[PDB]
Amino acid sequence: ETVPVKLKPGMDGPKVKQWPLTEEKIKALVEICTEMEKEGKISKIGPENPYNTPVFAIKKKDSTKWRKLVDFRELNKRTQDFWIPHPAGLKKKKSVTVLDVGDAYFSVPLDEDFRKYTAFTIPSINNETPGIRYQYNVLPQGWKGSPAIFQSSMTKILEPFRKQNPDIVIYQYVDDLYVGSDLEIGQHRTKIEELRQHLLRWGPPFLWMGYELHPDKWTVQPIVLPEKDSWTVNDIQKLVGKLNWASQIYPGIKVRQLCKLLRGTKALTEVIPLTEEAELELAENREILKEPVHGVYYDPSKDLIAEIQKQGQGQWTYQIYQEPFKNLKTGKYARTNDVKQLTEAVQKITTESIVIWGKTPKFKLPIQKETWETWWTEYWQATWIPEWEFVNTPPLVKLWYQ
Amino acid sequence: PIETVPVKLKPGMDGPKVKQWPLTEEKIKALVEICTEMEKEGKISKIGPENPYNTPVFAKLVDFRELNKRTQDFWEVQLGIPHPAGLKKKKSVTVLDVGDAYFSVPLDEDFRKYTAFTIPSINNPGIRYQYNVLPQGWKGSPAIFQSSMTKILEPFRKQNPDIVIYQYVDDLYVGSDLEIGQHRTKIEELRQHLLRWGLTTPDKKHQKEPPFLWMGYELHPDKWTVQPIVLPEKDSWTVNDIQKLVGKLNWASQIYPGIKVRQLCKLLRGTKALTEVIPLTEEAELELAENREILKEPVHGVYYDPSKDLIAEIQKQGQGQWTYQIYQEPFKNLKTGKYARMRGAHTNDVKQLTEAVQKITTESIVIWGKTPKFKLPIQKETWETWWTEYWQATWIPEWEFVNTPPLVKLWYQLEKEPIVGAETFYVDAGYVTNRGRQKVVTTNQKTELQAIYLALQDSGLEVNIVTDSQYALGIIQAQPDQSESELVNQIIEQLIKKEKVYLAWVP
Ligand SMILES: Cc1ccnc2c1NC(=O)c1cccnc1N2C1CC1
């Protein structure tokens, strides 16, 4: 018996364009949806329904099968807020394994009146045919309403493990379950596997292969300065420039003595032995950058933004902040091709974002829409889909990182 | 008979209440004969004065503007249309015209009351009716009908996986690979399946026959093309004539390789009226003539054979001009094309070619559901070098180097480190070198590039250049080889001339 869900006051349903798919993905999607229909999970629909959400087919890790990913982003934004908070202990756990508990949803009917909004279409190659249309009858994987609406039923099947094993921290985000602990990596994989049957046996593949995140070992990428034998006019110029930038963050940084070794229009390559004042000013500056600036705090009421930079050689740098210059985190990602790496980046970065603050970030990606639209689904494996926009990375910002 | 589709008016809106315009007794006459034949066939039915809604009727036409404004939205009629190059060849293709499309499809019982209209009396009331079927001119008719059509077909389709059917508004294209007689048999089999649903189709001798002119294309069951374009032979051309010409020239490029419009396009520069006459340039008539020529010889697109690979080949036609063709069997084109898109005021052929690959790729997924293997005039080394050093993420699928000049290359490369014993110019419009030299010779941004240019001019084959302009830095670091700006192009000329150049930025 179903709970009523509604769209935020005055809002209408999603009418999102479906991005063209490959015959491969389409065949998979047909194979899939045909069996979801046979099980009454979805139903075909008519002209009177004008809504639409985009679907994609992604691959599972060590599964022969394909997963159906519905981009419920637009819908999620139009869905009523529901009235689980985030465990800041989870980020301290040693090992966190991630499970896909999405299938649980397929056992809960969805309020008949809301269904029409879950509409999606299965395109056909070259517009040769109409295009198969469906709507969900149960709770769909990916929609923010689903976890909320299943919360109760969830807490119940999880109160026994949660008390028979309260050394385990368990967090649920949409189709995902984050299981934390401090146990030995061996004791973990076992306690994990028991939960699997304790869920199966209480009516689940894990994500990220069969792996553990190790949040306990996530650190900030402090800003670094070149440490070198002799310094040329170029080196110093590069140094001052970098320092000058970082001073808007760490105002204690001084360049006075460095700028001085630079008076005169000297040859770029000319080696400049550093004075005592200079050398000790750099020392201080170096000391300052050793840690993240103080004062930055996570505001739950603000958006979590994440920009990525291409460094080269399979190396990327990213930062997570809410207010420019005020990073909440910074990292690096290294090994394929550009796109694959950028996607593995985005996903890796979303997971942490989820583990640390329990919310996904808004990415700024250094790539053209069309290229991304085209290849992302190829290497994507997450059940969620962050939001994202596309930008033009300044050559100076790349320079100032890594 | 056929399932009814539930319709509703937009939220918080009432049915239409618009007054019937005054009508001619002669016109009242005809409407009543028409609306009586229609009530005998069930399409409509007299209603009582219970119904307060009304739609305008004129001579039979029913104006549904109002009701339409008030009716809900339906799912998109014909999102997109297939492109002939994505079809698989057929021995036979039969087009089935469908008359009374809407009139044989029932309308939601609870909606009919909104389709009410009135036939005025001649003597000082007028008859009142409502529709029981899909009215021509109504918002949802097209969709409810496509959808319905689809349902009727499904069976026939499951029993004839061989036949292929495409629904196009009121047409129906039916192909197969059946022996001549067999095909005609199936067709007539289909025609009855539609009759069992009051749907009427043309008899074999009244059916249109191949090729079929469709959306600017000319279609056979085995080969395609675009409907024959004739190039005018005027001696006086109007801005308008040139626009249309370019327009049409353009459309042809999807199959006719070699079509160029650059010179003709150049003719619209500065024009002040659609009727202004522009005389043709020497290069412009040379271009027209060349096209007129290429056109004279008809060329046929070939259909898709899914058992074979898709090959994509790209060539540089001119500065910023690209041509490509996709085929499965050498020169046996499924489709050709051009790309002139310049993203950003500056670029290099490497970046541009990549964008071409992307457009082609996208297009292919749309037409064939897969990407082609590319044959490109650039070597992996060249590609890799630029990719490896460009700030933006990029990717190019399976591609094979093709030695077909012109090959795309990088005309220059910035040293990654300052140069030893190469003079150092400091620029901010003027410079000051370390060796004493100087010259103090426009928008803010354009004054910057001016300096750099100066320095490049007066320097030797190796140079180190320091600037505070993060802008110019950006520009030049992207190593463009072509630009909208003339200044840049001169700089680029310099750049290509040098042996080693090192550019650096300082606050
Ligand atoms: C206009 C159109 C749109 C989509 N497909 C087709 C057609 N028309 C054809 O004439 C055609 C030609 C060759 C192969 N399929 C074709 N047909 C298929 C239906 C038999």
From Swiss-Prot, chain A:
Effect of Y297F: Confers resistance to delavirdine and nevirapine
Site (Essential for RT p66/p51 heterodimerization): W375, W388
Every Reverse transcriptase domain range: 39-213
Record-given protein name: p51 RT
Effect noted on mutating H198Y: Confers resistance to lamivudine, pyrophosphate analog PFA and zidovudine
Outcome recorded upon mutating L69V: Confers resistance to abacavir, didanosine, HBY 097 and zalcitabine
Region annotation RT 'primer grip': where it falls in the sequence: 206-214
Annotated phenotype, changing P109S: Confers resistance to lodenosine
UniProtKB/Swiss-Prot annotation, chain B:
Effect of I122L: Confers resistance to delavirdine, efavirenz and nevirapine
Variant or mutagenesis effect after changing T371I: Confers resistance to abacavir, lamivudine and zidovudine
Residue span, RNase H type-1 domain: 419-507
Effect the entry attributes to changing K204R: Confers resistance to lamivudine, stavudine, zalcicabine and zidovudine
Impact when changing F64L: Confers multi-NRTI resistance
Outcome when changing P221L: Confers resistance to atevirdine and delavirdine
Annotated phenotype, changing Y173H: Confers resistance to atevirdine, efavirenz, loviride and zidovudine
Annotated positions for site Essential for RT p66/p51 heterodimerization: W386, W399
UniProt-reported outcome of changing V105I: Confers resistance to zidovudine
Positions contributing to Mg(2+) 1 binding: D97, D170, D171
Phenotype upon changing K90N: Confers resistance to atevirdine, efavirenz, emivirine and nevirapine
Outcome of swapping Q130M: Confers both multi-NRTI and multi-NNRTI resistance
Effect of L61V: Confers resistance to abacavir, didanosine, HBY 097 and zalcitabine
Consequence of substituting P49R: Confers resistance to stavudine
Motif (Tryptophan repeat motif) on chain: 383-399
Effect of mutating Q146L: Confers resistance to pyrophosphate analog PFA
Binding of Mg(2+) 2, residues: D428, E448, D468
Effect of H193Y: Confers resistance to lamivudine, pyrophosphate analog PFA and zidovudine
Subunit note: Heterodimer of p66 RT and p51 RT (RT p66/p51). Heterodimerization of RT is essential for DNA polymerase activity. The overall folding of the subdomains is similar in p66 RT and p51 RT but the spatial arrangements of the subdomains are dramatically different.
Note in the entry: Error-prone enzyme that lacks a proof-reading function. High mutations rate is a direct consequence of this characteristic. RT also displays frequent template switching leading to high recombination rate. Recombination mostly occurs between homologous regions of the two copackaged RNA genomes. If these two RNA molecules derive from different viral strains, reverse transcription will give rise to highly recombinated proviral DNAs.
Function: Multifunctional enzyme that converts the viral RNA genome into dsDNA in the cytoplasm, shortly after virus entry into the cell. This enzyme displays a DNA polymerase activity that can copy either DNA or RNA templates, and a ribonuclease H (RNase H) activity that cleaves the RNA strand of RNA-DNA heteroduplexes in a partially processive 3' to 5' endonucleasic mode. Conversion of viral genomic RNA into dsDNA requires many steps. A tRNA(3)-Lys binds to the primer-binding site (PBS) situated at the 5'-end of the viral RNA.
UniProt-recorded name of the protein: Reverse transcriptase/ribonuclease H
Organism lineage: Viruses, Riboviria, Pararnavirae, Artverviricota, Revtraviricetes
Gene: gag-pol
Section of the entire sequence shown: 591 to 1124 of 1435
